[PDB]
């Protein structure tokens, strides 16, 4: 049944575990939120452009160019995709510690208890008071995109996904998508004589796509007694591994054989002289086998062009860089460490006066990192003790430029390269992503662990049907309408598959553990606890605590 | 060094003769007939104005 005065749904946020057999777990995560929806600020679609004359007009500022072209819509999307939505911090600890790999299974979603209210103002004498009252006949439009016709638009990009706190209400992300303006921009250094083109092109007859929610899809009209239920969507994806790899290229294979065991705990072991050592190496003209030059099964990780900007018709952009360990060289960019900026709803702390809170995610998987300053290329024919001209060192200048070194432009990717798939991030991390429709596809998307093979889960779009006053002129440029807002509950169920880790190691494994307050380490428990006034903060948890044997 | 005669069977066709190849079936991946305009900088959600 249903109707006004009868609630159409229930609130379940709790997470469940079930053991299907040996090592297997079915993780069923419920999540529910109250969502606050405002009447759209314009009833009609708009094609708008941002263009920076101030930033890009001055020389050398290219990196900050924001210029693009977008289609603004009245619709808003409820985006359930982040890890921080589905799990509470302890459930993330329990999973990160105990399980080798995890995989997505199904997703369900529902909307219920729709409530639309209207606002009037009185009496305007002294100070106005705003009176709130229901419209029982009003409705809310709801459209799900099953076929992914519309441009796929993850909200986590801007951190607009549903809030991470069950008890706080949350808001939708207004739906919008790109349009093709064909920007032109020119390259300069800090102080340079000349001009900068900095122009944007006219609309393209070939490339112009304009989509409309109403034309594209079926819209459900939900009044207070109505409820909407998405069917069960089943993921097809590859599981991801929850245990990090420590094992470098130089740790692969059989170690050399030591001559004899050391006498005392301080003493170092010794090896057969490199001249007489037996092994396999690709160096020519020298009779040696040494731990550095011996042949390894594959390359682990690879050098990458870093802080390079490639420019197609759209404009300059930094190409992605696969997340890899930061070596002791501390250099973040060459290894592609992610850096998030996020607000109080998703993170930060309610005590913080700053507008946003920022965190750099330094990758685990210590095997694939690259120290940039210590990488070097050596001349052929090979020689021990190269003179300066026989070795390519990072300290030298490239093209006569001081701060540009070969490791900037150098690219090692090849058939022999192996790297681990990067890791999920509990708050602020993206759970899944849609695969690009191109024929030749990337081996991984950079931000998202899971990539739906065929068809991604559909986007869920909502808006308030307009409430019109007595006077409505369809030809009028301006539209007067009744001030209106609404609220509704969103409930969803995400099922997962995971497998317990075996532990064969003698020694204790590393684990995620809370720590007493008063010591400054990252895990101090005060940060997961409320304050006196209720200010709460939610910070990224390390993932993949447990080591793994690569080879 | 390959030779047509050594390698293969040759049919001899006079004026009244005709030759017919059997049906050959391709195994291939289809190709997409619609172009993509969408640059790396057009991917994802735009900023909010």
UniProtKB/Swiss-Prot annotation, chain B:
Location within or outside the cell: Virion; Host nucleus
Superkingdom of this protein's organism: Viruses
Similarity-based family: Belongs to the parvoviridae capsid protein family.
Function comment: Capsid protein self-assembles to form an icosahedral capsid with a T=1 symmetry, about 22 nm in diameter, and consisting of 60 copies of two size variants of the capsid proteins, VP1 and VP2, which differ by the presence of an N-terminal extension in the minor protein VP1. The capsid encapsulates the genomic ssDNA. Capsid proteins are responsible for the attachment to host cell receptors. This attachment induces virion internalization predominantly through clathrin-dependent endocytosis.
Free-text domain note: The N-terminus of VP1 is sequestered within the mature capsid. It contains a phospholipase A2-like region and putative nuclear localization signals.
Protein name: Capsid protein VP1
Protein source organism: Parvovirus LuIII
Span of the entire protein shown here: 388 to 436 of 729
